[PDB]
């Protein structure tokens, strides 16, 4: 992403593809390594009634 315009034009012409649009090196668009804490949902059997194990 730090390549000059001359080198970018040379690479684009030499490969035939727009390379700066799809760079294989991740710079800033990736997710943060620190994330907010999650709250995972519970399944269908997490109920206090009509949940006898013989019925499932």
């Amino acid at each position: 992403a730090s390549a000059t315009r001359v080198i970018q034009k040379l690479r684009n012409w030499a490969s035939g593809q727009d390379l700066q649009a799809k760079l294989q090196l991740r710079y800033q668009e990736i997710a943060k390594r620190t994330q907010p804490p999650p709250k995972l949902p519970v399944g269908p059997s997490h109920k206090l009634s009509n949940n006898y194990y013989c019925t499932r």
Binding site: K47, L48, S49, N50
Partner: protein, 430 residues
């Protein structure tokens, strides 16, 4: 007859219910006790059992099982063992005082009923297991028994009928579960008040391992009046299969809480407004009624409008006729607090022998306390219903049933009250 009530004083059995006359032997002889009982004993066991059957009397203890058939379960030749009649005077159930009243005011009726039932089944002794808190009642019973022994009505010649019978009185030590049949038998036998399983039934293996029959004080005391006046008269009182008279203890939010003797099948509204002086604040102020003691569930005013006091009538009303203890609760009643107090009573009085009653009644007590505080979420109502259904029918005795039933009645009827309390708690914290 299609309308029941307005019982006549010439037909009331417990003529000294209020203690206005002498409770001793002289007063009992004036009131008509111990009359022709020698002739009854000479007519013998099969005639008395037939009289009880044609009277159609049901157990006053709670279950209501037909007294004639239950007493005819011991109509067998002896296998070398003695046979015993036992009187359940425990009266542990809340709302109930009728057995206490008839023990302390008509004790000779109880003694004559013990003699009649013991002869009808074939027996040498009647053990009256009285509640340990009824010390004065036990002393009055012993005074009456001493009077009967001195008069020769009991002991080595049962009124000159060549029958031998002894009436003992044994006191409990404060356990509601000792009012149960088999737990009472164990308490007499000297162990803890833990009920034993059936089979064996007490008619085969009972107190000390003999054939025995536990019967209610009211049932035993109305037995000789049934024998004297005939079973047809007692069956003529009351409806079909729910016959005779009954002692109703009306307590709670009524103007005159009292114990009265009334004909069976009486309307609840008529009974309350006639004998209790009505609900405090009025019938419109009435909210709920527990009609048969704390074992039976509650019923709201809408079904209390036209309900009767039969076993079958309360069964159709999804309740039962237990000890005929009518607890009345008005609009000012904290209904959830009352039911949680009943569940706390059952938690304190469960004997803890068997796992569903023990653990589940403790669980219901905790859940009901949180329901009173409002400290739960409304799925716990259905959870508590499922817990009560797990308790009911899976226990050794019927205390688990009698603890699951009030929770079931409260959930069945006053569920929006619970939900309103719970959402109010949720909104005043969040």
């Amino acid at each position: 007859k299609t309308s029941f009530g307005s019982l006549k004083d010439e037909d009331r059995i417990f003529t000294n219910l209020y203690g206005r006359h002498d409770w001793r032997l002289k007063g009992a002889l004036r009131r008509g006790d111990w009359y022709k009982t020698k002739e009854i004993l000479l007519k013998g066991p099969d005639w008395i059992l037939g009289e009880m059957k044609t009277s159609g009397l049901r157990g006053r203890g709670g279950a209501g099982f037909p007294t004639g058939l239950k007493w005819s379960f011991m109509n067998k030749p002896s296998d070398g063992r003695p046979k015993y009649l036992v009187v359940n005077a425990d009266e542990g159930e809340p709302g109930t005082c009728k057995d206490r009243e008839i023990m302390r005011h008509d004790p000779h009726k109880l003694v004559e009923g013990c003699l009649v039932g013991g002869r009808a089944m074939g027996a040498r002794a009647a053990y009256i297991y009285i509640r340990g808190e009824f010390y004065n009642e036990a002393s009055n019973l012993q005074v009456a028994i001493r009077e009967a022994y001195e008069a020769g009505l009991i002991g080595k010649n049962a009124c000159g009928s060549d029958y031998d019978f002894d009436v003992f009185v044994v006191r409990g030590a404060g356990a509601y579960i000792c009012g149960e049949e088999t737990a009472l038998i164990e308490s007499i036998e000297g162990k803890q008040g833990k009920p034993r399983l059936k089979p064996p039934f007490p008619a085969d293996v009972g107190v000390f391992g003999c054939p025995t029959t536990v019967a209610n004080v009211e049932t035993v005391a109305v037995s000789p009046t049934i024998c004297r006046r005939g079973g047809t008269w007692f069956a003529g009182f009351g409806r079909e299969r729910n016959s005779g008279t009954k002692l109703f203890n009306i307590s709670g939010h009524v103007n005159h809480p009292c114990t009265v003797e009334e004909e069976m099948s009486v309307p609840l509204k008529e009974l309350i407004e006639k004998h209790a002086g009505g609900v405090t604040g009025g019938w419109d102020n009435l909210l709920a009624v527990i009609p048969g003691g704390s074992s039976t569930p509650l019923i709201p005013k809408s079904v209390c409008e036209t309900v009767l006091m039969d076993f079958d009538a309360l069964v159709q009303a999804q309740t039962g006729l237990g000890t005929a203890a009518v607890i009345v609760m008005d609009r000012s009643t904290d209904i959830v607090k009352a039911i949680a107090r009943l569940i706390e009573f059952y938690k304190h009085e469960s004997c803890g022998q068997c796992t569903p009653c023990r653990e589940g009644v403790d669980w219901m007590n905790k859940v009901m306390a949180r329901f009173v505080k409002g400290d739960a979420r409304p799925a716990e109502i259905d959870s508590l219903w499922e817990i009560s259904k797990q308790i009911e029918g899976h226990t050794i005795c019927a205390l688990g049933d009698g603890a699951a039933w009030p929770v079931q009645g409260l959930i069945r009827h006053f569920r929006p009250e619970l939900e309103d309390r719970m959402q109010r708690f949720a909104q005043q914290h969040r």
